[PDB]
Design a protein around this ligand. Sequence first.
Ligand code: HEM
Ligand code: HEM
Ligand code: HEM
Ligand code: HEM
Ligand SMILES: COC(=O)c1cccnc1COc1cccc(O)c1C
Ligand SMILES: COC(=O)c1cccnc1COc1cccc(O)c1C
Lengths: 141, 141, 146, 146
Amino acid sequence: VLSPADKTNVKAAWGKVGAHAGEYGAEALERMFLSFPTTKTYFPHFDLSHGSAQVKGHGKKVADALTNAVAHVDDMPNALSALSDLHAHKLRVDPVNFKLLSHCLLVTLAAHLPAEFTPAVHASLDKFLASVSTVLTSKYR
Amino acid sequence: VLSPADKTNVKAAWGKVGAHAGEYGAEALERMFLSFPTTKTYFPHFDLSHGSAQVKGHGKKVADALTNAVAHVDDMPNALSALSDLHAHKLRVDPVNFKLLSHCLLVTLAAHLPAEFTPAVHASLDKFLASVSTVLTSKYR
Amino acid sequence: VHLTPEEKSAVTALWGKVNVDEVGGEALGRLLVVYPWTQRFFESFGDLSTPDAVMGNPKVKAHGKKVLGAFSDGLAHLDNLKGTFATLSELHCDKLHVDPENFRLLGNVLVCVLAHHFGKEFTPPVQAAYQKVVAGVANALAHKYH
Amino acid sequence: VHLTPEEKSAVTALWGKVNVDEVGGEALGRLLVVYPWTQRFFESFGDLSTPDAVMGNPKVKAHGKKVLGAFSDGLAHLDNLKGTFATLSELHCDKLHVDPENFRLLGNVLVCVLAHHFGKEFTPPVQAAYQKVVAGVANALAHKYH
Ligand code: HEM
Ligand code: HEM
Ligand code: HEM
Ligand code: HEM
Ligand SMILES: COC(=O)c1cccnc1COc1cccc(O)c1C
Ligand SMILES: COC(=O)c1cccnc1COc1cccc(O)c1C
């Protein structure tokens, strides 16, 4: 659950990502795969080589989902229901893996947006990604 | 995020507690204090001796809060806002302790309501307590 | 782990009554249902699609029996859990790459199952002693992470 | 205690450019702001009500420097992290009873701080190397729980 200030910070910071959605998405994925190689087993038939077109494409999907989450922060379980079906029912992703990707998303944002990654915004983003992770790891249909 | 089935499972199961609120609430607290001594550091001013009147009375408060939480499962942050301010803002309880208490609540329910504590209901109760725990440990106001 | 002589007697007395055909299967089964992501480690176990299917699954009951056997061995060697589970830790950490968190969950699910089976006989002091046991087992299964 | 030779080279090269007077305070300060329950361990530190209060708190910055000094000591003994943080493990586990998950959180906050300061130079391979560092530190600090 997010405070009004959290919603304000998340919308402000993620809005500055903009056209760098796919890039940041892909970078976060590649950081996760390289830092926590066990996460690669969730993508057995993917081309996970460095600079992979598939990873580029998939990072774009992740980022755009987050943009959607941000726009529907007051109705996230409804908006992310299909993504919840995928991650919670079909894939059954271990929630520890969501912590890893959320962390890598933070690392990526901090690496690219130093002026916006303040302690307050950091905290808000962390709570937001925790909210997303719970929604996607939970079966509520 | 709870499913319509989770909500149904929780209301039926917790509804069987009834007049056993103070008893089960108290028992759950004593199980936590005994099994995980570090949780006692949040209650230094308390009489935490076995069978204490203070712990038993507090157990009734906790059980009643859960009963209220069950009834307001669709607007928990508003309903639990006062308890959130207490646990998140003032007390600043580490979330790990909420996991310990939630686990002891399940143990109590299993010990007392074996017919209710089916695998599916076990899953729903655990997700319910996790949600209550997240709300009480989050600063969202 | 450090159990008082009074705790060890209560642990031993309760464990002697444990249904070795069912308790392990129910613990492993509840794990798979309450924490569905754990099912990913058991793809070759057949049908895990529903709670009833997980609990009744013969491979789940069979493997759960082996799990309960490990806890039995741990109780028989409380002074050397790291050595007793040395082989099992190599398997769960190097090969299976199971997250240490999952070790604590199963330990606590086992506790719930004991509570479920023995009701009022599973008193808070009895739970407290069993929590020391499952914490020690969970930790001994993860030293090879350390 | 691990890390490939290349990972050790990467970690050592970057740490040489780390401001030992600032990074520790940033990391500790962000820990307290992002995970506010951690403030409970620092009630003698004074004002921790707002993010600006925390980051500007002299005692936070001072203690953060000690924290980072311990990380430096870890990096100078990468193949012996358990011994390096042995005494600190006793303090944090036996005396302070800090739940080990918080150790991992601080480690990852430090990674965010490193990323924040170095930006593009904090490459995925550099991060992966440091992830093994902070995991080793967290593990070593929780050794008395093991
Ligand atoms: C903020 C967190 C996450 C978001 C927003 C997210 C979003 C998405 C999206 C948008 C898709 C594609 C859906 C489609 O193709 O229709 C997807 C697929 C997938 N995700 Fe995630 N995801 C997240 C976390 C994770 C994590 C942590 C893992 C595993 C470690 C994971 C594993 C997968 C897998 C295996 C697929 C299917 C890929 C395929 O086979 O095509 N996700 N996710
Ligand atoms: C998990 C579900 C929990 C629920 C439903 C809950 C509910 C409550 C309730 C109803 C009160 C009484 C407040 C009042 O009447 O004004 C309370 C107080 C309190 N709670 Fe909790 N609580 C939970 C978890 C925890 C945990 C895990 C801890 C610590 C380990 C904790 C620590 C405290 C403390 C220290 C008080 C103040 C008691 C006093 O000084 O009077 N709570 N909580
Ligand atoms: C926490 C206490 C645990 C105990 C006491 C335990 C015990 C055992 C035992 C005795 C075996 C048999 C190994 C052999 O015969 O060579 C085994 C194998 C296995 N364990 Fe566990 N285990 C635990 C936790 C876990 C958890 C949490 C998971 C996954 C979430 C897991 C996944 C597996 C898998 C996938 C196998 C092999 C299955 C197969 O052979 O097809 N274990 N475990
Ligand atoms: C994860 C890596 C960590 C490292 C390397 C580290 C390092 C240190 C060091 C060097 C000291 C000084 C000890 C002394 O001078 O006696 C210290 C003290 C302390 N640490 Fe940590 N620490 C870590 C994590 C944590 C965490 C996560 C918490 C709490 C959430 C924590 C809470 C404390 C407290 C309360 C003190 C004593 C404060 C005081 O003296 O007033 N530490 N730590
Ligand atoms: C902000 O959350 C939501 O959008 C929303 C709206 C209606 C029902 N459930 C939710 C989900 O909230 C969660 C879920 C998990 C963790 C968390 O910290 C929050 C706020
Ligand atoms: C449980 O409460 C609700 O579902 C609800 C209703 C209205 C607004 N926000 C919520 C928040 O949900 C949460 C919050 C935290 C964890 C979690 O797993 C859920 C579903």
